[PDB]
Amino acid sequence: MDIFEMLRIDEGLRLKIYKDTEGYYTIGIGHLLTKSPSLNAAKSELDKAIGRNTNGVITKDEAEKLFNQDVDAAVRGILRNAKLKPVYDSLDAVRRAALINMVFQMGETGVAGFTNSLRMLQQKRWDEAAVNLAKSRWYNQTPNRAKRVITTFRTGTWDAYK
């Protein structure tokens, strides 16, 4: 298992524009296109992202390309963020993947706000962090995903993705 396979499990693959769990236009492996309610605005973002007139449909290779960029962006986002970098650097590789997964889903700013959770993780108080992480809109709106990510933080194993 690795961060790419983990996110493929959590995000799926869809080759036509769809709405994500928040109702936002998305394509591929959870590539958010726009928060605009305009499908035309989403189609424009898509064409700009892929470099061609897609008519709202892409290939698997194209979806994987955007996914690679998106994972890269989440990691670089963590490393540039004063609140996330220390926590990331304190973690082992498996738990690092759980943090990348959160940032991929919610964005750098949204995760960096989990101040109390981040502290517990930095302290390696795993059970306490797991309890604190679940007291969140995140957990309540996407509980099965959040449970998987939290299990990964709590255990430092990939058991939740087996």
Which stretches of the chain bind Cl ion, using CB under 5 A? 30, 104, 131-132, 142, 144-145
Is residue 44 part of an annotated ligand binding site?
no
Residue found under tokens 């709106």:
141
Nearer to Cl ion, 91 or 130 (CB): 130
**Residue 128 a catalytic site member:** no
* Residue of 11, 45, 70, 108 marked active site: 11
**Residue 89 a catalytic site member:** no
Q: What type of residue is 72?
A: D
* Residue of 2, 5, 20, 128 marked active site: 20
C-alpha 42/C-alpha 96 separation (Å) is: 31
Is residue 114 part of an annotated ligand binding site?
no
Nearer to Cl ion, 85 or 119 (CB): 119
Helix (H, G, I), strand (E, B) or coil at 35: coil
DSSP state string for 52-83: S--TTB--HHHHHHHHHHHHHHHHHHHHH-TT
44-50 CB contacts, 8 Å cutoff, 24+ apart: 46/17
Nearer to Cl ion, 104 or 153 (CB): 104
Is residue 104 part of an annotated ligand binding site?
yes
Query: What positions carry a catalytic annotation?
Result: 11, 20
Binding-site residue positions for substrate: 32, 104, 117, 132
